[PDB]
Symmetry: C3
């Protein structure tokens, strides 16, 4: 109660895309924070803890080299441009699975978190490059949240 806060989760029913839902159990979106165009809107200036987690899953390793990225960006009203705040890269595959050997699943989580000075009207986005590898099987694996401290 009181402080601006949000904790949104990926829509498990949206295949191959990262769509944040707020209307779920153990999810938050109150005290001015809005979810518009898949982005969190800051209702007032202050110091905010921003964090997100994504979980990637793939069946075996393909011929091409896979890079998984997760990025939290800020779109300021003053600029109206996307600026990266937190990002990370992961590479699940060192070799393509030998032809004839069984394809084994791989899992790669990425967590991002930090405190930033935000202005009223700033929009925050948490995006990945490979939504086709996203894993929604279990609740609590893909989430995105902020809170004014």
């Amino acid at each position: 109660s009181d402080k601006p806060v949000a904790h949104v989760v990926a829509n498990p029913q949206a295949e191959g895309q990262l769509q944040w839902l707020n209307r779920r159990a153990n999810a938050l979106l109150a005290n001015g924070v809005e979810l518009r165009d898949n982005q969190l809107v800051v209702p007032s200036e202050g110091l905010y803890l921003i964090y997100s987690q994504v979980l990637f899953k793939g069946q075996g390793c393909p011929s091409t080299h896979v890079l998984l990225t997760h990025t939290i960006s800020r779109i300021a009203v003053s600029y109206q441009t996307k600026v990266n705040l937190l990002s990370a890269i992961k590479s699940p595959c060192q070799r393509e699975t030998p032809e004839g050997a069984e394809a084994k699943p791989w899992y790669e989580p990425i967590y991002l978190g930090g405190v930033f000075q935000l202005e009223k009207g700033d929009r925050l986005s948490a995006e990945i490059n490979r939504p086709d590898y996203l894993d929604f099987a279990e609740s609590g694996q893909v989430y995105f949240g902020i809170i004014a401290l």
Copy 2:
């Protein structure tokens, strides 16, 4: 002080289980049945880290899971709040492998809610780096 807070660490002497010791734990938060009990409603930052370690890669595929669950007073049943999966071995071999998992998020908790932080492979836990397998909350 003031607000409920807890920071418990894994018992390195507990074989085949993830057992939290009763050493931060103040301002109403209790540790009973290996679970943190919420003393009052409010917004809580929940976080946990586990460290997995193995001396090699087996023929079969190993899945490491870490999960923070909630047992709400209103909805009394185990519900996932934060969870993650890792696969340490892509190919069969002996060289050691290391896998950390960190979880963190803000949630609205009610008085009497019980929080658990659990793993599936306690035999792969790493206690070399004492104090690195932990589970904590703090009301914001």
Copy 3:
């Protein structure tokens, strides 16, 4: 805005070392927190959220086994002793790539709440600075905030 806070990022121009800068772009260091000797100084006692991230990168796997560590330590004023707060280990390479080397990425994120004293100094260190990746700001960071 009231609370002691810091969010510093790695210097991209410092080769082979982890040097924290207090920048003009989304980096914080206000309300008493100081950056001295590449170390964050706590201005007042309380519970602090501490977190850091590093990103390691290598252009293949070497003959020896690589262990990547990231560690947040505390240096108390009264003791001046080093206490480990947060650490993690990762192993990017299972076998040395036999002679087409492909790049690998391994990030390490740390986070926890700790009771800190006025004047305590916090350090965020790695063991393999030669594998550090600075291309994109916001991939190597270190921050605290009193809760």
